[PDB]
Automatic annotation (TrEMBL), chain A:
Organism (species): Pseudomonas aeruginosa
Family: Belongs to the N-Me-Phe pilin family.
UniProt protein name: Pilin
Source species taxonomy: Bacteria, Pseudomonadati, Pseudomonadota, Gammaproteobacteria, Pseudomonadales
Localization in the cell: Fimbrium
Parent-protein start and end of this portion: 73 to 143 of 143
From TrEMBL, chain B:
Membrane-spanning intervals of the chain: 6-24
Keywords in alphabetical order: Disulfide bond, Fimbrium, Membrane, Methylation, Transmembrane, Transmembrane helix
Covered range of the whole protein: 1 to 72 of 143
Record lineage: Bacteria, Pseudomonadati, Pseudomonadota, Gammaproteobacteria, Pseudomonadales
GO biological process: cell adhesion
Protein name as catalogued: Pilin
GO cellular component: pilus
Family: Belongs to the N-Me-Phe pilin family.
Keyword Transport: no
Annotated coiled-coil segments of the chain: none
Originating organism: Pseudomonas aeruginosa
Amino acid sequence: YVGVEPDANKLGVIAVAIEDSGAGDITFTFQTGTSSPKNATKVITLNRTADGVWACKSTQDPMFTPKGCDN
Amino acid sequence: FTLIELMIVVAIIGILAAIAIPQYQNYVARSEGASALATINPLKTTVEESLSRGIAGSKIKIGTTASTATET
C-alpha cells in the first residue's frame, strides 16, 4: 500500500491500477468542488508499459500542464 | 424686518466665509502615484514568472487576450 489515502490531496483522488504483467497507470483526477474550474475533471496519468517505461500524460490545458508531462 | 437683523446676517455671512482652504492638490498627486504604483506592481510577478517558465520576453505583452503556452 502506498501509505496515503485516495483523498489525501483534497484537489482530487489518486487511483493506482497496475496489471499483473507490470503495465498500469497512476491517475490524479481533479474533483469539482475542491479544484479550480480550469483544472476540474482533468486527469494526470503516469502510464507504465509492460517493458517498464514511464510516461506522463495530462488532459489539462497546455499552458497549465506541468513540465515533463505530455499533453 | 429691522436693519440690525440684516446687518447681523451680513456679519455672520462674512464670518462664515473667510474659512481658510488648505492645499489639496498634494493629496491628489500622492494618491495618484500610489494608485499607479499599485497598478503596475503586480505586473512584476507576471514578467518574472513568464521568464522563469521560458516564455520569450518579446512574447510578454499587455492585454486581455487569452495567454497561450507561448504568449503571456
